Every structure is written in C-alpha cells, then in structure tokens.
Design an enzyme around this catalytic site. Structure first.
Site, PDB file in Angstrom:
ATOM      1  CG  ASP A  22      -1.830   1.219   1.347  1.00  0.00           C
ATOM      2  OD1 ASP A  22      -2.068   1.883   0.332  1.00  0.00           O
ATOM      3  OD2 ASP A  22      -2.242   1.520   2.499  1.00  0.00           O
ATOM      4  CG  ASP A  73      -3.979   4.277  -2.187  1.00  0.00           C
ATOM      5  OD1 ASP A  73      -3.187   3.375  -1.808  1.00  0.00           O
ATOM      6  OD2 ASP A  73      -4.978   4.723  -1.501  1.00  0.00           O
TER       7      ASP A  73
END
Ligand SMILES: *[C@@H]1O[C@H](CO)[C@@H](O)[C@H](O)[C@H]1NC(C)=O
Length: 340
Positions: free
Chosen positions: A38, A226
């Site tokens: 992430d 992201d």
C-alpha cells in the site's frame, strides 16, 4: 545510500480485481501472512494472537503469535492506523520479516482491534505500507527504508504490475519488483511525473476528460497513486459531476449503470506530466452482464481524503491494471508505462 546487484519480486494474488496481496513471513520460524502492499500508508501490521475472538475478523485471519517466535523483540507502544475504509488498533513489536528473497528486522503493529466492516471482507490479513516515513504512525521506519539500508537493491525503486483477474489458476495475479521494473510486464517507455513533495506518493494532475470535454479538475488538482486502493477515487463533488456525465445512479458506496449501457460509456482521460492516460469503459466497468435488468458497478467511487494529503484524486488498482507503475525514491518521481 548504497546500491548492490539484487532485485527481488513478490508474486501477488488477484481477488475479483479489488484485492491484490502477496505473502510475507514474520518470526522464527516464519509465520506467513497475506498482506496488501500500500503506497498510501507507511506502517506494517498483521492481526495479533492477542486480538479478542469477539472481533470476528480475528477468527477469520492469520494471527501473529509472538510466543512462537524466538526472534521477537517486545516494544508494546499503542498505535491506531486510520485507512480510508476502516481503522485498526494495537501495539508495536519487532521481528524478522521475509519478503521476496529479502530478510529485514522490522518494527510492525500487532493488531488487537479489527472491525468486522471492512476486515471480514478482506482476503488479506494485513498491510505492508510502501509510503514514506513522514506518514509513518509512531515514526517507525517503513520496510522499504530498512531494505535500502542493507545496500543490496540495484536501485532505490519498486514497481507494481496488477493483472486482470482470471477464470484460470495459471494467471499471475500481479507482481512487485523491489529495486527495479520487469520489462516483461510493460512496453513503450516510462513517462515520469515529479512528486509535489518527498513524503507522499502524490503528483500534480492537470485535467480529467470525459470524452472531448475537460469538464473536471479544470484548474488543477492532486492525484494520490495508491497501490492499496481498489478504485479510482475523487471528491464527492468531483464524482457526482463525473457520474452525471456517465448517467450513473448513486448507491450506498459505489455507482452503477444499467449493464447494457456499460460498453458505450465514454473514455476517461487523466492528464499527468505531458501525457493523457485514457481508460475505456471496459477498463472501469465491472461488465458482469449485458442485460438492461441487471446493474453493473463502476470502479470509480467517491472518497473525501482529509488534509493534509487531501482533498485529492486517488489512482488505485483500476488505473495500475492499465499502467505499470514504478515508484522512484532516489529521484522522488513516479513512472507510468503501458502494462502487458
Ligand atoms: C519502542 O521503540 C522505539 C523505536 O526505536 C524506541 O525508541 C522505544 O523506546 C521503544 N520502547 C520500548 C518499551 O521497548
């Protein structure tokens, strides 16, 4: 800095084109976990054996048990990690982490509080934050800084390939390269944008087209890149004007369109550096059917990210599936090439 000769790859699994995760080992002997990698967060965590089984999420995931690791080092400091779609809480621990070929001593969260929504919908157990130390809760060193410190990586970069899902077992779900890119999963050239600042994988976006009309982010706005978000997200205002142009009904936390309308929905372009990044309807519609009597989810939803990071667009898995992404820590830039 110090550059060696290693690159290391992590094989990812793709669950329904919404969750991409791979395997890490923690402790001696290794306890294995499925983790999202992430770029929008900077902490490592996994659920803990000390998580009450009244958290049903802890009945259904792998739990790290420090009592079975001879390499564990106590710390015990409390922390809370706020993600877009939910929150976890626990305490800091240290142990050895196996990721690809690479062994690194790492400080991480043992999570003792893991809400049913959303974590009961997670195929993964935990998270490896690939963000900067500037965002790290408890000012803990992120795993990528600890790997750089070893001076074994050929380059201070990492790269994401997210595949389209399969009906097959034999499909590669995705791949992270630590210290490189893999030319086997992109073609043409990398085209680079510089980060606003070091400390956040966020870049300047100049425009968002819906056909021929630049009817969105007309002045300029922010794109968070992201790897841990399923969708492309803009701000509630931004989206309700996107979703008007498309002809899509607002539901609780996704937009839909009649399945038959899906394929004739227009192109959506994102102006980043000197290049238009164009997604077709096939790229952003979950085309599950062609019936006028079913509804089909879009892979662009609405997310108001709080300051200082936001308000911002987020380019997640919907976008990375089309564009192989390189994250350059040496030169604080992001490179996009066309995925294959
Ligand atoms: C927890 O870890 C930090 C990070 O280096 C350290 O400075 C702190 O004093 C530690 N606390 C305990 C009780 O081990």
């Amino acid at each position: 800095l110090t550059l060696g000769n290693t690159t290391s790859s992590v094989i990812l699994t793709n669950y329904m084109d919404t969750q991409y995760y791979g395997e890490i080992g923690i402790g001696t002997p290794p306890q294995t976990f499925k983790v999202v990698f992430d770029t929008g967060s900077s902490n490592v965590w996994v659920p803990s054996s000390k998580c009450s089984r009244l958290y049903t999420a802890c009945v259904y995931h792998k739990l790290f048990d420090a009592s079975d690791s001879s390499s564990y080092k106590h710390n015990g400091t409390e922390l809370t990690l706020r993600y877009s779609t939910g929150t976890v809480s626990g305490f800091l621990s240290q142990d050895i982490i196996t990721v690809g070929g690479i062994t690194v001593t790492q400080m991480f969260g043992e999570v003792t509080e893991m809400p049913a929504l959303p974590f009961m919908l997670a195929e993964f157990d935990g998270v490896v934050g690939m963000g900067f130390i500037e965002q790290a809760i408890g000012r803990v060193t992120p795993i990528f800084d600890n790997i750089i410190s070893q001076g074994v990586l050929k380059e201070d970069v990492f790269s994401f390939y997210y595949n389209r899902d399969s009906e097959n077992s034999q499909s590669l779900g995705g791949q992270i390269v630590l210290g490189g890119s893999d030319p086997q999963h992109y073609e043409g050239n990398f085209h680079y944008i510089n980060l606003i600042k070091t400390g956040v994988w966020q870049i300047q976006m100049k425009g968002v087209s819906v056909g021929s009309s630049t009817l969105l982010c007309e002045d300029g706005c922010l794109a968070l890149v992201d790897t841990g978000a399923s969708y492309i997200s803009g701000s509630t205002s931004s989206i309700e004007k996107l979703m008007e142009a498309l002809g899509a009904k607002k539901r609780l936390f996704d937009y839909v369109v009649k399945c038959n309308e899906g394929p004739t929905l227009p192109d959506i372009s994102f102006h980043l550096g000197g290049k238009e990044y164009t997604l077709t309807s096939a790229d952003y519609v979950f085309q599950e059917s062609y019936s006028s009597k079913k509804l089909c989810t879009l892979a662009i939803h609405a997310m108001d990210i709080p300051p200082p990071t936001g308000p911002t667009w987020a380019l997640g898995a919907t976008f990375i599936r089309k564009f192989y992404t390189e994250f350059d820590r040496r030169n604080n830039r992001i490179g996009f090439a066309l995925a294959r």
